[PDB]
């Protein structure tokens, strides 16, 4: 049968979670997507010759640590932790997202990828070395993306599928 992979995109508001998700789903850059919309989107993709079904949850809204929200995030098999390379605060928030994923999944080795988005912009404030070194501290991959040009979009999502495959 066709394997379905449940992927969750997390990170601060404004980092480009919806833009990255829509680039994967529509193959189009969407510069405007209601920042309050949290929803899931499916796509069949060929990753290493295998057609698999991706189910992408694009998160949104304020933090809520209820039993119901934890139950819903626990359905995720892998997580993209996204920051924007021109927003230092979004990068400094990454550790909080990683800690919450580890808590709900009750595991130290949840499939996860660090994503530095907005790589097309010249206003960089987070050095690539700092981001690579954070991924190394966590023992995860780091992917540089741009939802605008499509740089790294398949690399981010497909690496996460490969991290789920190795974890199973
Ligand atoms: C979605 C997620 C999550 N979202 C946040 C979140 C959201 C908005 C702002 C912030 N800010 C951090 C920096 N300080 C200001 C608040 C943090 N944290 O984790 C990440 C995945 C696992 C789980 S489980 C659970 N109950 C969550 C929630 N709600 C989550
Ligand atoms: N230049 C550039 N702008 C981006 C990129 N991704 C998102 N944006 C912009 O960043 C803002 C936030 O994007 P959005 O996808 O709504 O972020 P979300 O709140 O994390 O879902 C919008 O103004 C987007 O046009 C990207 O890779 N490059
Ligand atoms: Mg959004």
Coordinates of C-alpha atoms and ligand atoms in Angstrom, one line a residue:
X1 CA 0.0 0.0 0.0
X2 CA 1.0 3.7 -0.3
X3 CA 2.6 4.9 3.0
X4 CA 1.3 8.2 4.4
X5 CA 3.7 10.5 6.3
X6 CA 2.3 13.0 8.7
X7 CA 4.6 16.1 8.7
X8 CA 4.1 19.1 10.9
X9 CA 5.5 22.6 10.0
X10 CA 6.2 24.7 13.1
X11 CA 7.9 27.9 14.0
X12 CA 7.2 31.6 14.8
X13 CA 4.5 33.5 13.0
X14 CA 5.8 35.1 9.8
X15 CA 8.7 32.7 9.0
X16 CA 7.1 31.3 5.9
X17 CA 5.4 28.0 7.1
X18 CA 2.4 28.5 4.8
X19 CA 4.5 29.7 1.9
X20 CA 6.7 26.6 2.2
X21 CA 3.7 24.3 2.5
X22 CA 1.9 25.9 -0.5
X23 CA 5.1 25.8 -2.6
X24 CA 5.1 22.0 -2.0
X25 CA 1.3 21.6 -2.6
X26 CA 0.7 24.1 -5.5
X27 CA 4.2 24.5 -6.9
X28 CA 3.5 28.3 -6.6
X29 CA 4.8 31.0 -4.3
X30 CA 2.0 32.6 -2.3
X31 CA 3.2 35.9 -0.6
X32 CA -0.1 36.3 1.2
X33 CA -1.8 33.5 3.1
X34 CA -4.1 34.3 6.1
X35 CA -1.7 34.0 9.1
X36 CA -4.4 32.5 11.3
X37 CA -5.2 29.5 9.0
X38 CA -4.0 26.2 10.4
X39 CA -4.9 23.3 8.1
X40 CA -3.6 20.1 6.6
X41 CA -2.9 19.4 2.9
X42 CA -2.1 16.1 1.1
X43 CA 0.1 15.5 -1.9
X44 CA 1.3 12.3 -3.5
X45 CA 5.0 12.6 -4.3
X46 CA 7.7 10.4 -5.6
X47 CA 10.6 10.4 -3.1
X48 CA 13.4 8.1 -4.1
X49 CA 11.1 6.4 -6.7
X50 CA 8.5 5.5 -4.1
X51 CA 5.1 7.2 -4.4
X52 CA 4.1 8.2 -0.9
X53 CA 1.3 10.4 0.4
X54 CA 2.4 13.4 2.4
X55 CA -0.1 14.9 4.9
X56 CA 1.3 18.4 5.8
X57 CA -0.1 20.2 8.9
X58 CA 0.8 23.9 8.5
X59 CA 0.5 25.2 12.1
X60 CA -0.8 28.7 13.1
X61 CA -2.2 30.6 16.1
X62 CA -1.1 31.2 19.7
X63 CA 0.5 28.6 22.0
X64 CA -2.0 26.3 23.7
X65 CA -0.8 23.5 25.9
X66 CA -4.1 21.6 26.4
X67 CA -4.5 17.8 26.3
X68 CA -6.4 18.2 23.0
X69 CA -3.6 20.3 21.3
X70 CA -0.9 17.9 22.6
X71 CA -3.0 14.9 21.2
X72 CA -3.2 16.7 17.8
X73 CA 0.5 17.5 17.5
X74 CA 1.3 13.9 18.7
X75 CA -0.2 12.7 15.4
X76 CA 2.9 14.2 13.6
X77 CA 5.6 11.7 12.7
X78 CA 8.1 14.3 11.7
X79 CA 8.5 18.1 12.2
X80 CA 10.1 21.0 10.3
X81 CA 11.3 23.7 12.7
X82 CA 11.4 26.8 10.6
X83 CA 13.0 30.2 11.3
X84 CA 13.6 33.1 8.9
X85 CA 17.3 34.0 8.2
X86 CA 16.5 37.7 8.6
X87 CA 14.7 37.3 11.9
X88 CA 16.9 36.6 14.9
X89 CA 14.0 36.1 17.3
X90 CA 12.5 33.3 15.1
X91 CA 15.9 31.5 15.4
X92 CA 16.1 32.0 19.2
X93 CA 12.6 30.5 19.5
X94 CA 13.7 27.2 17.8
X95 CA 14.8 25.5 21.0
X96 CA 11.3 26.0 22.5
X97 CA 9.6 24.3 19.5
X98 CA 12.1 21.4 19.8
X99 CA 11.5 21.0 23.5
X100 CA 7.7 20.9 23.0
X101 CA 8.0 18.3 20.3
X102 CA 10.2 16.1 22.5
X103 CA 7.7 16.5 25.3
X104 CA 4.5 15.5 23.3
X105 CA 6.2 12.7 21.5
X106 CA 8.0 11.6 24.8
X107 CA 11.1 10.9 22.9
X108 CA 14.7 12.2 22.5
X109 CA 14.9 11.2 18.7
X110 CA 11.8 12.6 17.0
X111 CA 12.4 13.0 13.2
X112 CA 13.1 16.8 12.7
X113 CA 14.8 19.1 10.3
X114 CA 15.9 22.7 11.0
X115 CA 14.8 25.0 8.2
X116 CA 16.3 28.5 7.5
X117 CA 13.8 30.2 5.2
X118 CA 13.8 33.4 3.2
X119 CA 17.3 32.5 1.7
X120 CA 16.5 34.7 -1.3
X121 CA 16.6 37.9 0.9
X122 CA 19.7 40.0 1.4
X123 CA 18.8 41.1 5.0
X124 CA 20.5 38.1 6.7
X125 CA 20.8 38.4 10.5
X126 CA 21.4 34.7 11.4
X127 CA 24.7 33.3 10.1
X128 CA 24.6 30.0 8.2
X129 CA 27.4 28.7 10.6
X130 CA 25.2 29.5 13.6
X131 CA 22.2 27.6 12.1
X132 CA 24.4 24.7 11.0
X133 CA 25.9 24.5 14.5
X134 CA 22.4 24.5 16.1
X135 CA 21.4 21.5 13.9
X136 CA 24.7 19.8 14.9
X137 CA 23.9 20.4 18.6
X138 CA 20.6 18.6 18.1
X139 CA 22.0 15.9 15.8
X140 CA 19.5 16.9 13.0
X141 CA 19.8 18.1 9.4
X142 CA 19.7 21.8 8.4
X143 CA 18.2 22.9 5.1
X144 CA 18.3 26.4 3.6
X145 CA 15.0 27.3 1.8
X146 CA 13.2 30.0 -0.1
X147 CA 9.5 29.5 -0.6
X148 CA 9.8 32.4 -3.2
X149 CA 12.3 30.7 -5.5
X150 CA 11.7 27.0 -4.4
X151 CA 15.2 26.7 -3.1
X152 CA 15.4 23.7 -0.7
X153 CA 11.7 23.0 -0.6
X154 CA 11.7 19.3 -1.6
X155 CA 15.1 18.9 0.3
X156 CA 13.4 20.0 3.5
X157 CA 10.3 17.8 3.2
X158 CA 11.9 14.8 1.6
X159 CA 14.8 14.8 4.2
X160 CA 12.1 14.7 6.9
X161 CA 10.5 11.7 5.2
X162 CA 13.9 10.0 5.0
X163 CA 14.4 10.8 8.8
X164 CA 11.0 9.1 9.5
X165 CA 12.0 6.0 7.4
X166 CA 15.3 5.7 9.4
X167 CA 13.4 6.2 12.8
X168 CA 10.8 3.4 12.0
Ligands
LIG1 C1 2.7 23.7 17.9 C2 3.8 23.4 18.9 C3 4.2 24.7 19.6 N1 3.8 25.9 19.3 C4 4.4 26.6 20.2 C5 4.3 28.1 20.2 C6 3.3 28.7 19.4 C7 3.2 30.1 19.3 C8 4.1 30.9 20.0 C9 5.1 30.3 20.7 N2 6.0 31.1 21.4 C10 7.4 30.6 21.8 C11 8.3 31.7 22.2 N3 7.7 32.5 23.3 C12 6.4 33.1 22.9 C13 5.5 31.9 22.5 C14 5.2 28.9 20.9 N4 5.3 26.0 21.0 O1 5.1 24.6 20.5 C15 5.0 22.7 18.3 C16 4.8 21.2 18.1 C17 4.6 20.5 19.4 C18 3.5 21.3 20.2 S1 2.6 20.5 21.4 C19 1.6 21.9 21.7 N5 0.6 21.9 22.6 C20 2.0 22.9 20.8 C21 1.4 24.2 21.0 N6 0.9 25.2 21.1 C22 3.1 22.5 20.0
LIG2 N1 11.2 36.8 0.3 C1 10.6 35.8 1.0 N2 9.4 36.1 1.6 C2 8.9 35.0 2.1 C3 9.3 33.7 2.1 N3 8.4 32.8 2.7 C4 7.5 33.6 3.2 N4 7.7 34.9 2.9 C5 6.9 36.1 3.4 O1 7.0 36.1 4.8 C6 5.7 36.5 5.3 C7 5.1 35.3 6.2 O2 4.8 34.2 5.3 P1 3.8 33.1 5.8 O3 3.9 32.0 4.9 O4 2.4 33.7 6.1 O5 4.4 32.7 7.2 P2 3.7 31.8 8.4 O6 3.0 32.7 9.4 O7 4.9 31.1 9.1 O8 2.7 30.9 7.7 C8 4.8 36.9 4.1 O9 5.0 38.3 3.9 C9 5.5 36.1 3.0 O10 5.3 36.7 1.7 C10 10.5 33.4 1.4 O11 11.1 32.3 1.3 N5 11.1 34.5 0.9
LIG3 MG1 0.7 30.6 8.0

